[PDB]
Symmetry: C5
Subunit: 346 residues, 5 copies
């Protein structure tokens, strides 16, 4: 008969002594808030800043016995966000926020419904820009584990405990793709219970494993740098004598493999250690410079070394030729059989 918003104003008003500043079960057991999120959007995972933007639906559930109506005939009284500052709510925050905001377009994007036994569902929409430290040792083949962690701010462990619900604690939207990554399905769920000189505060966290799309770096970086090493060798499939074809086509490989090494570290943070794209760009400069070093070894013989003198001339220039037709692919393919296996076992 009486409408619920009219019914609820006396359920939690100044009458019946409801004070929104006081947690449920006061001077009792701690409040068990159970949580689950729903990732709408995900991404812009910057590595210069080592953070990522996420857009979630944070659902929180607890039990307020002061709100447990009995006589109203329905099962779920909702509550618009205008009266949402009138009940108790948990003081959740994110321990690695780095700035975040609500969404208020056409209405505060907030949801609240109250069951008969005082079970309270509270769902809001948040955009977060969460920090995650990026480990870039094996850079195009890394698995980034960027986390997010949810803590109480004012209430300690003996007053308020966060939990993940067992019914799908992290859902992901259906067509959620990433431009550079794959969000794996297994999401680790564990506690991070903090300690300060103020006290100990509850924490729960989720761990998202992000595996890269290697195919972009394979297209822009590896495959052109693979062919210049092949360009380094067909220029050695060359005429009898030393020639300017052995000169300009050797420094051709120098200009390209440094250009590929210049544009390699374009959008990378200035990490102190060495990453996997470096030791590819190192060898793809080392085998480039070993093409000019063979021509100088030929020029060390072509200027140094009339039937006996001409026999001593080609007694060295072909001992160096028929080996480097074989030795250059041997040391290169023994590198790839050692390079790729290390980055396909980690």
């Amino acid at each position: 008969p009486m409408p619920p918003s009219e019914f609820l104003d006396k359920l939690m008003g100044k009458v019946s002594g409801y004070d929104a500043r006081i947690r449920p079960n006061f001077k009792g057991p701690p409040v068990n808030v159970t949580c689950n999120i729903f990732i709408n959007s995900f991404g812009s995972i910057a590595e210069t800043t080592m953070d990522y933007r996420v857009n979630i639906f944070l659902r929180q559930q607890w039990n307020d016995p002061r709100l447990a109506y009995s006589e109203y005939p329905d099962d779920s009284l909702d509550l618009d966000p205008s009266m949402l500052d009138s009940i108790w709510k948990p003081d959740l925050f994110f321990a690695n926020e780095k700035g975040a905001n609500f969404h208020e377009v056409t209405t505060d994007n907030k949801l609240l419904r109250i069951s008969k036994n005082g079970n309270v569902l509270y769902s809001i929409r948040i955009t977060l820009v969460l920090a995650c430290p990026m480990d870039l040792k094996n850079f195009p083949m890394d698995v980034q584990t960027c986390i997010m962690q949810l803590e109480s701010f004012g209430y300690t462990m003996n007053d308020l405990i966060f939990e993940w619900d067992e019914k799908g604690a992290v859902q992901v939207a259906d067509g959620l793709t990433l431009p550079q990554f794959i969000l794996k399905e297994e999401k680790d769920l564990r506690y991070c219970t903090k300690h300060y000189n103020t006290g100990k505060f509850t924490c729960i966290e989720a761990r998202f494993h992000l595996e890269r799309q290697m195919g972009y770096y394979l297209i822009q970086m590896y495959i052109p740098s693979l062919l210049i090493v092949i360009l380094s060798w067909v220029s050695f499939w060359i005429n009898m004598d030393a020639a300017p074809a052995r000169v300009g086509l050797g420094i051709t490989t120098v200009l390209t493999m440094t250009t590929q090494s210049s544009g390699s570290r374009a959008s990378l943070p200035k990490v102190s250690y060495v990453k996997a794209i470096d030791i590819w760009m190192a060898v793809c400069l080392l085998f480039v410079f070993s093409a000019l070093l063979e021509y100088a070894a030929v020029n060390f013989i072509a200027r140094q070394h009339v039937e006996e003198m001409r026999k001593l001339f080609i007694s060295r220039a072909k001992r160096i030729d028929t080996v480097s037709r074989v030795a250059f692919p041997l040391v290169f393919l023994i590198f790839n059989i050692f390079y790729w296996i290390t980055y396909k076992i980690i």
Copy 2:
């Protein structure tokens, strides 16, 4: 006689029991909100972020029988946005917001008018930065379908239903142009009715088909890369012997076609797969390197190969010359007759 704002304060005040926290037709059929937008501005369609900024007039229409006056002699009571928090409004939001805001310069840019039978028109001005996933397989010749979708947040399907009106559900402003795209006239209108563990919520969406302006990429990228392949061949329209004119003008084509390939992927997201500008830049490097590979094949003969010996010298250097005057345009024009037709049928 009595002014409408004075008349309306008793129409929806504490007298006559109007509660703005309660939807129309409560414990009845769901509220049928019908919607249409008006795109003022559109654009800044970034592909690094995969989003786009739009500036709309969101019109919403529904029926509140509590507001249906009968005795006032007019037909449309308006209402300034100062008293706009005093009636019920739908809690619409955008499922791919990524940040949005109102416009409050000189007045809240909001409109509200109420007919005699309780029909309510509600128009606001919003700037949205909506996410859309970009498919870039055939990159300069793609048709991007970026959508926008309008959902309820608190009310489920049995309480509130969104509809597009049949009288022009998406209007576009008159001189609305795009810097890089063409907004097609046919705009798909369909439902995206969501399901959560909270419940099922209404959704309607519009699908904007965006076809690119190919002419910019044709000017900067294709036409210069077309002429270097022609530059690759007039350098083969060359003198009798091998010459440094066949040397420097061949690596000239190497420096330019990599420069055109360097500046090609300037503002592109790091997509894993391969796009259509790549397989043009691949062939426009492959036919470049097949110009130096012919000179090395000549230098493989010019150093290897006195009337019989000089007849064997030109017995190969012209068998390779008169074929590549014909074979280079044959394999190039058989590429364009296969390249362009695939990107003119999709």
Copy 3:
């Protein structure tokens, strides 16, 4: 005797029935709001975004007969912006806002004064980021006409009409300069009266004509590209035979004129059509490549062509020499006499 703020609180308070939610001359003729702006700052005219930032003083004047006091001895009651939400104000907005804001440093920068006959002056300070479509056909020699337009949002044409006052409808600050443009003095003033399915709404607009500073593009782009075409020709003022001075100094012009063509399209939007800086950079590559094409024509003769044979050798190499000393300036100066006149008549 009684102070004006005390006098005004009863002039527009709950006594005397003044309702700020109701326009003047209600159920009468429409309100004639007359407007004029004062541009303090202007600029940051971006072409990537196709917008520009302006900082104005928006003055609005109308007549509220409810505010027409008679007995107070002064002529202009002012009103601080604290009580500014207490009278009726027009709901002006900008139809191409793209974000805007007020200025509230040390005080709301707002002004309000009321004459005896109810004439109301209302002046505020706004920063606007207004969109204007940029036509870039003749790019360094274009006249951009970027507009701004002022509309009502809630009131239709039969309730509220905007006008420009005839006494200087747009003033400009005294030392207002632009970094790249010249704001012309003639400013077009016309109507843009909108029509929607909601109704028809008033509009007035001003049109600012912006002519560029050509001298920057003449310094960085034209004058260096002019001298390389002269560098293309003094390298043809060369010795008798073919020489490497005719080789490296020809590709010198290739590297520079592409470098000038690379840095040409640095900060430009990706317009589909072709602009005037392109067809200068096209010809300044075409006459560059016609310098190497003459050396290859010489090398087509120097390898092809003993007193009769040496007479046939210079029977072609000087027929090509003494023409290109004349033909290269003839086709170049016939280009400038056609290029510049088209861009000095539009």
Copy 4:
């Protein structure tokens, strides 16, 4: 006995008729507000935008006789910023704001104290982003005079007058350094009294003279470009004949001096006129191209010009050699003795 905040609530409350909307000395002489600032931070002086960020303490002093208590035993009643909207304050603003904000971290950073005779000190903390037009004629050796100006917005000259106090009208923080500039100690203080069709409004302004740090541009730009002109000449300290050492080492100077000219105009606004770094980069390309022009003059003689014929050969190649060993430093050092003196007298 009675605490001051309790004492002050009746000093300026509804009792004793204090109205915060009414200036002191109403219908009397104008209010003399005296001002002084304290620059905490200064800088980020961008020249693309032609503005600069400053962080000040704006102190304002005036006299309100309505606030002049007599009987309370102290000398300075302070007032927290919660009650700061309760007294009259001047409506100061900045005529070249371009966006500004207060600081509200942990408390509104605002200060207010009231002496016995109604003298009121009012100090706030503001961050400003002030526009200043940049004159860049002599660019690395310029003295920029960027100003800031403080005006009233609502009160005209006959009601409110701004003054600088004579006791240090602009203080600067102690260790305030600039990354690229030197703030000179002499700061000009003068009026800029505005006139509008509204009326005439008070203004005071301060003029900050900013002299650059020339040493950065001397390190990156001048000293490398100085040595290439020396590199241009040691390559002329060369062997007897024409050689490829006179070829590649000449175009070496072309590639570097254009690279230094490319990176010169990296962060500069697109000013129409010519600046001082240009006419250094012009001459440091002109003397570069006069090194290749001498080799072509030698090649004009080395191909043109057997005991009499060999005497005529070196009768020109050494007349050009021993002059350019002297003429190149003579015209270069006569340039620096004219270049630097003009930019060391202005």
Copy 5:
């Protein structure tokens, strides 16, 4: 019995005369506020702007005897941030703010608890963007000392004194890493007590010593520039005569060592003085140009200098050869034994 929020509303309400506008111990000794921070996040230490972003938990402790309850049986009454504007709080601010903000996601991230003896703990979460002047004399090997300083704004020294507590005045979060730096453990704690014409105000400050990660600059800059100096010398391990192998491989070192010098000063502020990466890039161009200067010295002999004439030819070309095989590593390794020791003692 009575709940604390109900108990506290009469403890600090209008009854019992608590005025939040009045400091504790009024007309008494100054309030001793003791402080400690907790750095959650740290970084984005920009050097273009010379600032850094930090995310702290600011804890403040003082004693308000007006709040000292006696009869309530607990020891710590908390207080939600809704009623937080109802007690006295210190007006702390940061003397080098450059913009800062609170965090209000899901709740104002603020904490307040009150002991029995009026001890008040007050903890808030702030994001700061603090300015620090960067000294870059020895740039990759510098120790930056960026500070933060906490001052009162309204209360002078005789009313409010800040202190660091002796129990860990700066804590740092556990896994706090930096992308480019190492935050040292020793943090200097000292006073910075300000003086103005207003009065003298309290200050405390903390000094964070930041030592760089040298390994990134060693990977990108030093190690490639080390090998080009080795590339400069193996090209001198060359054949007998002068050769184009001594020509192109010498200017190869010119192009790379300027490319490494171009990309060196990529993200650096325009400091006037010279930094340590410059005098490495200077010498790594000087020993590059001393490779071409030896070839020109050989070409000064190879063109100048038949059994006696050929003995005088190699009487100089090997006196210059066998010295530069020894003199080039001697002057280079005597540089590193002087370069690195200066930057490993400071």
